[PDB]
Coordinates of C-alpha atoms and ligand atoms in Angstrom, one line a residue:
Chain A
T3 CA 2.4 56.6 -107.9
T4 CA 3.9 53.7 -109.8
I5 CA 1.4 52.2 -112.3
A6 CA 1.7 48.8 -114.1
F7 CA -0.3 49.0 -117.4
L8 CA -1.0 45.6 -118.8
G9 CA -2.3 45.9 -122.3
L10 CA -0.8 48.7 -124.4
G11 CA -3.0 48.3 -127.5
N12 CA -5.0 51.1 -129.3
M13 CA -6.7 52.2 -126.0
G14 CA -3.9 51.2 -123.5
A15 CA -1.1 53.0 -125.4
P16 CA -2.7 56.6 -125.3
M17 CA -4.1 56.0 -121.8
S18 CA -0.6 55.1 -120.5
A19 CA 0.9 58.2 -122.3
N20 CA -1.6 60.4 -120.4
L21 CA -0.5 58.8 -117.1
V22 CA 3.1 59.5 -117.9
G23 CA 2.2 63.1 -118.8
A24 CA 0.5 63.5 -115.4
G25 CA 3.7 62.6 -113.5
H26 CA 3.2 58.9 -112.8
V27 CA 5.9 56.2 -113.2
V28 CA 4.4 53.8 -115.7
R29 CA 5.6 50.2 -116.1
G30 CA 4.1 48.2 -118.9
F31 CA 3.6 44.9 -120.7
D32 CA 2.1 43.9 -124.0
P33 CA 2.7 40.7 -126.0
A34 CA 3.0 42.8 -129.3
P35 CA 6.5 44.3 -129.8
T36 CA 5.0 47.1 -131.9
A37 CA 2.6 48.0 -129.1
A38 CA 5.4 47.8 -126.4
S39 CA 7.9 49.9 -128.5
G40 CA 5.3 52.6 -129.1
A41 CA 4.6 52.7 -125.4
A42 CA 8.3 52.9 -124.5
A43 CA 8.7 55.8 -126.9
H44 CA 6.3 57.9 -124.7
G45 CA 8.0 56.9 -121.4
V46 CA 6.6 53.6 -120.3
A47 CA 9.2 51.2 -118.9
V48 CA 8.2 48.0 -120.7
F49 CA 9.0 44.5 -119.2
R50 CA 9.1 41.1 -120.8
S51 CA 6.4 39.6 -118.6
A52 CA 3.4 41.0 -116.7
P53 CA 4.6 39.7 -113.3
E54 CA 7.7 41.8 -113.7
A55 CA 5.7 44.9 -114.7
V56 CA 3.5 44.5 -111.5
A57 CA 6.4 44.0 -109.0
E58 CA 7.0 47.6 -107.9
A59 CA 3.5 49.0 -108.7
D60 CA 0.9 50.7 -106.4
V61 CA -1.7 50.4 -109.2
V62 CA -2.2 47.7 -111.8
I63 CA -4.4 48.7 -114.8
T64 CA -5.5 46.0 -117.3
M65 CA -6.8 46.8 -120.8
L66 CA -7.2 43.3 -122.4
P67 CA -9.5 41.8 -125.1
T68 CA -11.5 39.2 -123.1
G69 CA -12.5 38.0 -119.6
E70 CA -10.5 34.8 -120.1
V71 CA -7.3 36.9 -120.8
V72 CA -8.1 39.2 -117.9
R73 CA -8.6 36.3 -115.5
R74 CA -5.3 34.6 -116.7
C75 CA -3.4 37.9 -116.3
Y76 CA -4.8 38.2 -112.7
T77 CA -3.7 34.7 -111.7
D78 CA -0.3 35.3 -113.4
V79 CA 0.4 38.6 -111.5
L80 CA -1.4 38.5 -108.2
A81 CA 1.4 36.7 -106.3
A82 CA 3.8 39.3 -107.7
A83 CA 1.8 42.3 -106.5
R84 CA 2.5 44.0 -103.2
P85 CA -0.3 43.9 -100.5
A86 CA -3.2 46.4 -100.9
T87 CA -2.1 47.1 -104.5
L88 CA -5.1 48.7 -106.4
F89 CA -6.2 46.8 -109.4
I90 CA -8.3 48.5 -112.0
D91 CA -9.7 46.5 -114.9
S92 CA -10.7 48.9 -117.7
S93 CA -11.3 46.0 -120.2
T94 CA -14.8 45.5 -121.5
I95 CA -15.8 42.0 -120.3
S96 CA -18.8 40.2 -118.9
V97 CA -20.4 41.1 -115.6
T98 CA -19.8 37.5 -114.4
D99 CA -16.1 37.6 -115.4
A100 CA -15.7 41.1 -113.8
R101 CA -17.1 39.8 -110.5
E102 CA -15.0 36.6 -110.5
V103 CA -11.8 38.6 -111.1
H104 CA -12.8 41.2 -108.5
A105 CA -13.3 38.4 -105.9
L106 CA -10.0 36.8 -106.9
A107 CA -8.1 40.1 -106.5
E108 CA -9.7 40.8 -103.1
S109 CA -8.8 37.3 -101.9
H110 CA -5.2 38.3 -102.2
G111 CA -5.8 41.5 -100.1
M112 CA -5.8 43.7 -103.2
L113 CA -8.3 46.5 -103.8
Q114 CA -10.1 46.1 -107.1
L115 CA -12.4 48.0 -109.4
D116 CA -14.1 47.4 -112.8
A117 CA -13.8 50.6 -114.7
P118 CA -14.6 50.0 -118.4
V119 CA -14.5 53.0 -120.7
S120 CA -16.4 54.7 -123.5
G121 CA -15.0 57.2 -126.0
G122 CA -12.7 55.0 -128.1
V123 CA -9.2 55.7 -129.3
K124 CA -10.0 59.4 -129.8
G125 CA -11.3 59.8 -126.3
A126 CA -8.3 57.9 -125.0
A127 CA -5.8 60.2 -126.8
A128 CA -7.8 63.3 -125.8
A129 CA -8.1 62.1 -122.1
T130 CA -11.9 62.5 -122.4
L131 CA -12.8 58.8 -121.6
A132 CA -15.9 58.1 -119.6
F133 CA -15.1 55.5 -116.8
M134 CA -18.1 53.6 -115.5
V135 CA -16.9 52.1 -112.2
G136 CA -18.0 49.2 -110.0
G137 CA -16.5 48.6 -106.5
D138 CA -16.2 50.3 -103.1
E139 CA -16.6 54.1 -102.9
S140 CA -13.4 54.3 -100.8
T141 CA -11.5 52.3 -103.4
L142 CA -12.7 54.7 -106.2
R143 CA -11.7 57.7 -104.1
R144 CA -8.1 56.2 -103.9
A145 CA -8.2 55.5 -107.6
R146 CA -9.5 58.9 -108.6
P147 CA -6.1 60.7 -109.1
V148 CA -5.0 57.9 -111.4
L149 CA -8.2 58.0 -113.4
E150 CA -8.5 61.8 -113.7
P151 CA -5.7 62.3 -116.2
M152 CA -7.3 59.7 -118.5
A153 CA -10.9 60.8 -118.0
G154 CA -13.6 63.3 -119.1
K155 CA -16.0 61.6 -116.7
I156 CA -15.9 59.2 -113.8
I157 CA -19.2 57.5 -112.6
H158 CA -19.6 55.2 -109.7
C159 CA -22.2 52.7 -110.8
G160 CA -22.5 50.5 -107.7
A161 CA -20.7 47.3 -106.4
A162 CA -18.3 45.1 -108.4
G163 CA -19.6 44.4 -111.9
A164 CA -21.9 47.5 -112.0
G165 CA -19.5 49.3 -114.3
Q166 CA -19.6 46.5 -116.9
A167 CA -23.4 46.2 -116.4
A168 CA -24.0 50.0 -116.9
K169 CA -21.9 50.1 -120.1
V170 CA -23.5 47.0 -121.6
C171 CA -27.0 48.3 -120.9
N172 CA -26.3 51.7 -122.4
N173 CA -24.6 50.2 -125.6
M174 CA -27.5 47.8 -126.1
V175 CA -29.9 50.7 -126.0
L176 CA -27.6 52.7 -128.4
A177 CA -27.5 49.8 -130.9
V178 CA -31.3 49.6 -130.9
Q179 CA -31.6 53.4 -131.3
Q180 CA -29.0 53.5 -134.2
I181 CA -31.1 50.9 -136.1
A182 CA -34.4 52.6 -135.3
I183 CA -33.1 56.0 -136.5
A184 CA -31.8 54.3 -139.7
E185 CA -35.2 52.7 -140.4
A186 CA -36.9 56.1 -139.8
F187 CA -34.6 57.9 -142.4
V188 CA -35.2 55.2 -145.0
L189 CA -39.0 55.2 -144.4
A190 CA -39.1 59.0 -144.6
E191 CA -37.2 59.0 -148.0
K192 CA -39.6 56.4 -149.5
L193 CA -42.6 58.5 -148.1
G194 CA -41.2 61.6 -149.9
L195 CA -40.1 63.3 -146.6
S196 CA -36.7 64.9 -146.9
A197 CA -33.8 63.9 -144.6
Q198 CA -33.5 67.5 -143.3
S199 CA -37.2 67.7 -142.5
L200 CA -37.2 64.4 -140.6
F201 CA -34.0 65.5 -138.8
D202 CA -35.6 68.9 -137.8
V203 CA -38.7 67.1 -136.5
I204 CA -37.1 64.2 -134.6
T205 CA -34.4 66.4 -133.0
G206 CA -37.2 68.6 -131.6
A207 CA -39.4 65.8 -130.6
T208 CA -39.6 62.6 -128.4
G209 CA -37.5 60.5 -130.7
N210 CA -34.4 62.6 -130.3
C211 CA -31.1 60.8 -129.3
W212 CA -27.4 60.9 -130.0
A213 CA -27.9 58.3 -132.9
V214 CA -29.6 61.1 -134.9
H215 CA -28.4 64.5 -133.4
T216 CA -24.7 63.5 -133.6
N217 CA -24.5 60.2 -135.5
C218 CA -27.1 61.0 -138.2
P219 CA -26.8 58.1 -140.7
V220 CA -27.6 60.2 -143.8
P221 CA -25.3 62.9 -145.1
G222 CA -26.2 66.6 -144.7
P223 CA -28.0 67.3 -141.5
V224 CA -24.9 66.7 -139.3
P225 CA -21.8 67.6 -141.4
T226 CA -19.4 65.9 -138.9
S227 CA -21.3 62.5 -138.7
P228 CA -19.7 59.4 -140.2
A229 CA -22.3 59.3 -143.1
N230 CA -20.5 62.4 -144.6
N231 CA -17.1 60.7 -144.4
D232 CA -17.7 57.2 -146.0
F233 CA -18.7 55.9 -142.5
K234 CA -15.2 56.0 -141.1
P235 CA -15.4 55.3 -137.4
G236 CA -16.4 56.9 -135.1
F237 CA -17.6 53.7 -133.4
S238 CA -17.0 50.6 -135.5
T239 CA -19.4 47.8 -136.2
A240 CA -16.7 45.4 -135.0
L241 CA -16.8 47.1 -131.5
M242 CA -20.6 47.5 -131.3
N243 CA -20.8 43.8 -132.3
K244 CA -18.4 43.0 -129.5
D245 CA -20.5 44.9 -126.9
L246 CA -23.8 43.3 -128.1
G247 CA -22.1 39.8 -127.7
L248 CA -21.6 40.7 -124.1
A249 CA -25.1 42.1 -123.7
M250 CA -26.3 38.7 -125.1
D251 CA -24.1 36.9 -122.5
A252 CA -25.7 39.0 -119.8
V253 CA -29.2 38.2 -121.1
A254 CA -28.4 34.4 -121.3
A255 CA -26.8 34.4 -117.8
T256 CA -29.8 36.2 -116.2
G257 CA -32.6 34.7 -118.3
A258 CA -33.7 38.2 -119.2
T259 CA -36.3 39.0 -121.9
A260 CA -34.7 41.5 -124.3
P261 CA -36.4 41.1 -127.7
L262 CA -35.2 44.4 -129.4
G263 CA -31.7 44.1 -127.9
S264 CA -31.4 40.6 -129.2
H265 CA -32.8 41.5 -132.6
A266 CA -30.2 44.4 -132.7
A267 CA -27.5 41.9 -131.7
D268 CA -28.5 39.6 -134.6
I269 CA -28.6 42.6 -137.1
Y270 CA -25.1 43.8 -136.1
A271 CA -23.5 40.3 -136.0
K272 CA -24.6 39.8 -139.6
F273 CA -23.6 43.3 -140.6
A274 CA -20.1 42.8 -139.0
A275 CA -19.5 39.8 -141.3
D276 CA -19.3 42.3 -144.2
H277 CA -18.7 45.8 -142.8
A278 CA -16.9 45.5 -139.4
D279 CA -14.6 48.4 -140.4
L280 CA -17.5 50.9 -140.9
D281 CA -19.2 53.1 -138.3
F282 CA -22.1 51.2 -136.8
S283 CA -24.5 53.9 -138.3
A284 CA -23.7 52.3 -141.7
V285 CA -26.3 49.7 -140.7
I286 CA -28.8 51.9 -142.6
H287 CA -27.5 50.3 -145.8
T288 CA -28.0 46.7 -144.7
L289 CA -31.7 46.8 -143.9
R290 CA -32.7 45.2 -147.3
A291 CA -30.6 42.1 -146.3
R292 CA -33.4 41.9 -143.7
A293 CA -36.2 42.2 -146.3
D294 CA -38.7 39.4 -146.1
Chain B
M1 CA -56.5 87.8 -137.5
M2 CA -60.0 86.9 -136.2
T3 CA -61.7 84.3 -138.4
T4 CA -64.7 82.0 -138.6
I5 CA -63.6 78.4 -138.0
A6 CA -65.6 75.2 -138.4
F7 CA -64.4 72.6 -135.9
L8 CA -65.4 69.0 -136.8
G9 CA -64.5 66.6 -134.0
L10 CA -64.9 68.0 -130.5
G11 CA -63.5 65.0 -128.5
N12 CA -60.6 64.8 -126.0
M13 CA -58.3 66.8 -128.3
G14 CA -60.9 68.8 -130.3
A15 CA -62.8 70.3 -127.3
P16 CA -59.7 71.9 -125.7
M17 CA -58.3 73.0 -129.1
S18 CA -61.6 74.7 -129.9
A19 CA -61.7 76.4 -126.5
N20 CA -58.4 78.1 -127.2
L21 CA -59.6 79.3 -130.6
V22 CA -62.7 80.8 -128.8
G23 CA -60.3 82.3 -126.2
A24 CA -58.3 83.9 -129.1
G25 CA -61.4 85.7 -130.4
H26 CA -62.3 83.4 -133.3
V27 CA -65.9 82.5 -134.0
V28 CA -66.0 78.7 -133.8
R29 CA -68.7 76.7 -135.4
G30 CA -68.6 73.1 -134.1
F31 CA -70.0 69.7 -135.0
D32 CA -69.5 66.3 -133.4
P33 CA -72.0 63.4 -133.8
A34 CA -71.5 62.5 -130.1
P35 CA -73.8 65.1 -128.3
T36 CA -71.8 64.8 -125.1
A37 CA -68.7 66.0 -126.9
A38 CA -70.7 68.8 -128.5
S39 CA -72.2 69.9 -125.2
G40 CA -68.8 70.3 -123.6
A41 CA -67.5 72.4 -126.5
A42 CA -70.7 74.6 -126.4
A43 CA -70.0 75.3 -122.7
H44 CA -66.7 77.0 -123.6
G45 CA -68.2 79.1 -126.4
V46 CA -68.4 77.0 -129.6
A47 CA -71.6 77.5 -131.6
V48 CA -72.7 73.9 -132.1
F49 CA -74.6 72.9 -135.3
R50 CA -77.0 70.1 -136.2
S51 CA -74.8 68.7 -139.0
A52 CA -71.2 69.0 -140.3
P53 CA -72.4 70.6 -143.6
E54 CA -74.2 73.4 -141.6
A55 CA -71.1 74.1 -139.5
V56 CA -69.0 74.3 -142.6
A57 CA -71.3 76.6 -144.6
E58 CA -70.1 79.9 -143.3
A59 CA -66.5 79.1 -142.4
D60 CA -63.1 80.5 -143.6
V61 CA -61.3 77.6 -142.1
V62 CA -62.4 74.0 -141.4
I63 CA -60.5 72.0 -138.8
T64 CA -61.0 68.2 -138.5
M65 CA -59.9 66.2 -135.5
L66 CA -61.3 62.7 -136.2
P67 CA -60.2 59.2 -135.1
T68 CA -59.4 57.5 -138.4
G69 CA -58.7 58.0 -142.1
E70 CA -62.0 56.4 -143.0
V71 CA -63.8 58.9 -140.8
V72 CA -61.8 61.8 -142.3
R73 CA -62.7 60.6 -145.8
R74 CA -66.3 60.2 -144.9
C75 CA -66.5 63.7 -143.4
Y76 CA -64.7 65.3 -146.4
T77 CA -67.2 63.6 -148.7
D78 CA -70.1 64.9 -146.7
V79 CA -68.9 68.5 -146.3
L80 CA -66.7 69.7 -149.2
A81 CA -69.6 70.6 -151.4
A82 CA -71.2 72.6 -148.6
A83 CA -68.1 74.8 -148.0
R84 CA -67.5 78.1 -149.8
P85 CA -64.9 77.8 -152.6
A86 CA -61.2 78.3 -151.5
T87 CA -62.0 77.5 -147.8
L88 CA -58.9 76.3 -145.9
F89 CA -59.2 72.7 -144.6
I90 CA -56.8 71.6 -141.9
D91 CA -56.8 67.9 -140.9
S92 CA -55.2 67.6 -137.5
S93 CA -56.2 63.9 -137.2
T94 CA -53.5 61.3 -137.2
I95 CA -54.1 59.1 -140.2
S96 CA -52.0 57.2 -142.7
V97 CA -49.8 59.0 -145.2
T98 CA -51.9 57.3 -148.0
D99 CA -55.2 58.5 -146.5
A100 CA -53.8 62.0 -146.0
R101 CA -52.8 62.3 -149.7
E102 CA -56.2 60.9 -150.8
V103 CA -58.2 63.4 -148.7
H104 CA -55.8 66.3 -149.7
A105 CA -56.4 65.6 -153.4
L106 CA -60.2 65.2 -152.7
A107 CA -60.3 68.6 -151.0
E108 CA -58.3 70.3 -153.8
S109 CA -60.6 68.7 -156.5
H110 CA -63.5 70.5 -154.7
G111 CA -61.6 73.8 -154.9
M112 CA -60.5 73.9 -151.2
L113 CA -57.0 74.6 -149.8
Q114 CA -55.8 71.7 -147.6
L115 CA -53.1 70.9 -145.0
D116 CA -52.3 67.8 -143.0
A117 CA -51.4 69.1 -139.5
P118 CA -51.3 66.2 -137.0
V119 CA -50.3 67.1 -133.5
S120 CA -48.3 65.8 -130.6
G121 CA -48.8 66.7 -126.9
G122 CA -52.1 64.9 -126.0
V123 CA -54.9 66.4 -124.0
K124 CA -52.6 68.2 -121.6
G125 CA -50.8 69.9 -124.6
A126 CA -54.2 70.6 -126.1
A127 CA -55.6 72.4 -123.0
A128 CA -52.3 74.4 -122.5
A129 CA -52.0 75.3 -126.2
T130 CA -48.5 73.7 -126.3
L131 CA -49.2 71.2 -129.1
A132 CA -46.6 70.6 -131.8
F133 CA -48.2 70.8 -135.3
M134 CA -46.3 68.9 -138.0
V135 CA -47.6 70.4 -141.2
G136 CA -47.7 69.0 -144.8
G137 CA -48.8 71.1 -147.8
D138 CA -48.1 74.4 -149.6
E139 CA -45.9 77.0 -147.9
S140 CA -48.4 79.8 -148.7
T141 CA -51.3 77.8 -147.4
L142 CA -49.4 77.4 -144.1
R143 CA -48.8 81.1 -144.1
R144 CA -52.6 81.6 -144.4
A145 CA -53.1 79.0 -141.6
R146 CA -50.6 80.3 -139.1
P147 CA -52.8 82.8 -137.2
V148 CA -55.4 79.9 -136.7
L149 CA -52.8 77.4 -135.5
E150 CA -50.8 79.8 -133.2
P151 CA -53.5 80.0 -130.4
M152 CA -53.4 76.1 -130.1
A153 CA -49.7 75.6 -130.6
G154 CA -46.3 75.5 -128.9
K155 CA -44.5 74.6 -132.1
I156 CA -45.5 74.7 -135.8
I157 CA -43.1 72.9 -138.2
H158 CA -43.5 72.7 -142.0
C159 CA -42.5 69.2 -143.0
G160 CA -42.9 69.2 -146.8
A161 CA -45.7 68.5 -149.3
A162 CA -49.1 67.0 -148.5
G163 CA -48.7 64.0 -146.3
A164 CA -45.3 65.0 -144.9
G165 CA -46.9 66.1 -141.5
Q166 CA -48.3 62.6 -141.1
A167 CA -45.0 61.0 -142.3
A168 CA -42.9 63.0 -139.9
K169 CA -45.1 62.1 -136.9
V170 CA -45.3 58.4 -137.7
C171 CA -41.5 58.1 -138.2
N172 CA -40.9 59.9 -134.8
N173 CA -43.5 57.8 -133.0
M174 CA -42.1 54.5 -134.4
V175 CA -38.7 55.5 -133.1
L176 CA -40.3 56.4 -129.7
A177 CA -42.0 52.9 -129.5
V178 CA -38.7 51.2 -130.2
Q179 CA -36.9 53.4 -127.6
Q180 CA -39.5 52.8 -124.9
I181 CA -39.2 49.0 -125.3
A182 CA -35.4 49.2 -125.4
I183 CA -35.3 51.4 -122.2
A184 CA -37.6 48.9 -120.5
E185 CA -35.3 46.0 -121.5
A186 CA -32.2 47.8 -120.1
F187 CA -33.9 48.5 -116.7
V188 CA -35.0 44.9 -116.3
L189 CA -31.6 43.5 -117.4
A190 CA -30.0 45.9 -115.0
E191 CA -32.2 44.6 -112.1
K192 CA -31.3 41.0 -112.9
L193 CA -27.6 42.1 -113.0
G194 CA -27.8 43.8 -109.6
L195 CA -27.4 47.3 -111.1
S196 CA -29.8 49.8 -109.3
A197 CA -32.5 51.7 -111.3
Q198 CA -31.1 55.0 -110.1
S199 CA -27.6 54.0 -111.3
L200 CA -28.7 52.9 -114.7
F201 CA -30.8 56.1 -115.0
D202 CA -27.8 58.3 -114.1
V203 CA -25.5 56.5 -116.6
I204 CA -27.9 56.3 -119.6
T205 CA -29.0 59.9 -119.1
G206 CA -25.4 61.1 -119.1
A207 CA -24.4 58.9 -122.1
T208 CA -25.3 58.0 -125.7
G209 CA -28.4 56.1 -124.9
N210 CA -30.3 59.1 -123.4
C211 CA -33.8 59.8 -124.8
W212 CA -37.2 61.0 -123.7
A213 CA -38.3 57.5 -122.9
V214 CA -35.8 57.4 -120.1
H215 CA -35.3 61.1 -119.0
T216 CA -39.0 61.9 -119.0
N217 CA -40.9 58.6 -119.3
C218 CA -38.6 56.4 -117.1
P219 CA -40.4 53.0 -116.8
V220 CA -39.4 52.2 -113.2
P221 CA -40.6 54.2 -110.2
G222 CA -38.1 56.5 -108.5
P223 CA -35.6 58.3 -110.8
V224 CA -38.2 60.6 -112.4
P225 CA -41.1 61.1 -109.9
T226 CA -43.3 62.7 -112.5
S227 CA -43.2 59.7 -114.9
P228 CA -46.2 57.3 -115.2
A229 CA -44.4 54.5 -113.4
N230 CA -44.9 56.5 -110.2
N231 CA -48.6 56.9 -110.8
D232 CA -49.7 53.3 -111.5
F233 CA -48.9 53.8 -115.2
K234 CA -51.8 56.2 -115.8
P235 CA -51.4 57.8 -119.2
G236 CA -49.5 59.9 -120.2
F237 CA -49.6 58.4 -123.8
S238 CA -51.8 55.4 -123.7
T239 CA -50.8 52.0 -125.1
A240 CA -54.1 52.2 -127.2
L241 CA -52.8 55.4 -128.9
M242 CA -49.2 54.1 -129.5
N243 CA -50.7 50.9 -130.9
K244 CA -52.8 53.1 -133.3
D245 CA -49.6 55.0 -134.4
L246 CA -47.7 51.8 -134.9
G247 CA -50.6 50.5 -137.0
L248 CA -50.1 53.6 -139.1
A249 CA -46.3 53.1 -139.2
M250 CA -46.9 49.5 -140.5
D251 CA -49.3 50.9 -143.1
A252 CA -46.5 53.3 -144.3
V253 CA -44.0 50.4 -144.3
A254 CA -46.4 48.2 -146.3
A255 CA -47.2 51.0 -148.8
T256 CA -43.5 51.9 -149.4
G257 CA -42.0 48.3 -149.3
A258 CA -39.6 49.7 -146.6
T259 CA -37.8 47.3 -144.3
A260 CA -38.2 48.4 -140.6
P261 CA -37.2 45.3 -138.6
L262 CA -37.2 46.8 -135.1
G263 CA -40.2 49.1 -135.8
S264 CA -42.2 46.1 -137.0
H265 CA -41.1 44.1 -133.9
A266 CA -42.1 47.0 -131.7
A267 CA -45.5 47.0 -133.5
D268 CA -46.0 43.3 -132.8
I269 CA -45.1 43.8 -129.1
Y270 CA -47.4 46.7 -128.7
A271 CA -50.3 45.0 -130.6
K272 CA -50.1 42.1 -128.1
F273 CA -49.7 44.4 -125.0
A274 CA -52.7 46.6 -126.2
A275 CA -55.0 43.5 -126.1
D276 CA -55.2 43.7 -122.3
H277 CA -53.3 46.9 -121.3
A278 CA -54.8 49.5 -123.7
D279 CA -55.6 51.8 -120.8
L280 CA -52.0 51.9 -119.4
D281 CA -49.2 54.3 -120.4
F282 CA -47.1 52.7 -123.2
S283 CA -44.1 52.6 -120.8
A284 CA -46.0 49.9 -119.0
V285 CA -44.7 47.4 -121.7
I286 CA -41.9 46.9 -119.1
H287 CA -44.4 44.4 -117.4
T288 CA -44.1 42.0 -120.4
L289 CA -40.3 41.6 -119.7
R290 CA -40.7 40.6 -116.0
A291 CA -41.8 37.3 -114.8
Ligands
9ON301 C1 -13.8 66.4 -114.9 C2 -13.2 65.0 -114.7 C3 -11.8 65.1 -114.1 C4 -10.8 64.2 -115.0 C5 -10.3 65.1 -116.2 O1 -11.1 65.9 -116.7 O2 -9.2 64.9 -116.6 C6 -14.0 64.1 -113.8 O3 -14.4 64.6 -112.7 O4 -14.4 63.0 -114.2
9ON302 C1 -46.4 78.0 -131.2 C2 -46.7 79.1 -132.1 C3 -47.2 80.2 -131.2 C4 -48.5 79.9 -130.5 C5 -48.5 79.6 -129.0 O1 -47.5 79.8 -128.3 O2 -49.6 79.3 -128.6 C6 -45.3 79.3 -132.7 O3 -44.5 79.7 -131.9 O4 -45.1 79.1 -133.9

């Protein structure tokens, strides 16, 4: 299988290296020379334009920063692609943008999936990414052998856009949970309840979630959590802020009522102005900026 | 070790808790000022008394299961002088941290041992003896108390000094309230986006957002057939009770000067929902997010 990989950034570079390692012919494009060089070092044939990368490909994967860039990439390359080429967008973009680009690709007789990922650069390098996939079951089946070498998990979420929707809903819940957990630890400390005692109680009770059992925002109870390593990501505030921006777009576009999600979105937007480079669990230390 | 226990408060939680103590071979001396409550407890073997001071007079252990801090304080004031010196008082009521520490000090000033030991599990947990006791007070006192708590309990966890049981419960339940609202928001947003309830359920439960509020208390019918959404939102854990716990969380927040932006938002949402939907499971808050 020949794969054109468009977007060879912090995620795209290690993803494409895993595809090379699984026996695929990988063709590539990135507008950053440092990204392109790094990708060529691990076996990707890099081209000067995306239409060139796509010309001989059975599969075209996009990993790009915004819906606008994904859409422009599609209109740039679709005429260059061969018929029934499989397009996989693994960018994280809005549900609306995902569906528009899916419809565009299928208008050209391509097969298309949205397949955004969770797991970050670490997951990308380790080939343990979780792909949340929207599109046809038969298209996903065809895509599976390409996805497998990048993936720890592959989940079919529904029709086009469902992958983006599922990821955005989960990460909105996560953001709320990470703040709620942080509030709980600060309240406990002011009440004279130790961090370890609260940890032991919450992890054995109804409040338990990844935000505490793995991402515990106070040092000690989970030695590997970012709180014990100066809040090094992990999962950066910058990226959580980005996902919440998309959750808010989804909320605006549907007219949905999401008071805690929107409050979390506000909290992380403000926090990202100062601490974008910290793990999102570091929000524990910005709660007194909220003080009224 | 078989003991004489006074049980003050024989309501929805108190009655089944006391029945398990009788079943374990303890002599249980009960009082409740609602005769209906007392009648039910008597039917399962509790010796019911005319007054709280009478029930307390010959007890090694005194358990209170009462609705508010005010009622606990009132009870302690009426009974502490009647109890034998160095009687062990366990308050399994859910009351504010401040109230718990006040009544703990009151008990100790009268020469009594005292623990706060609020419980989770509701009436079903109470009947099955699978309650979780979250305990605050002295380690040795808890040691003394264990044989009494064991026949009512699935879990006994020591949380710290007096008040820490209440603190741990109120922190956990604040988080829960926030999570239940957030899960409801996700499911409604998913529906407006064309993502099926089953699909969202499968994703969140396999991902970082998983929590009891979704995996056990899923607010949409279908993915978890045992959840309240499939049974007309019959509790479960009532909105009335969650609103009570959120009131206590807001008391703790006010007393400490903590900032809890989402916990306080969740308290405001549940306070409004409880006005007309007190009798529904707290997952029913999902109704507020739909038009
Ligand atoms: C187990 C995984 C296969 C892909 C991989 O593990 O590389 C999956 O089925 O998603
Ligand atoms: C829960 C308590 C034992 C009592 C019981 O299972 O009823 C314990 O395991 O500490």
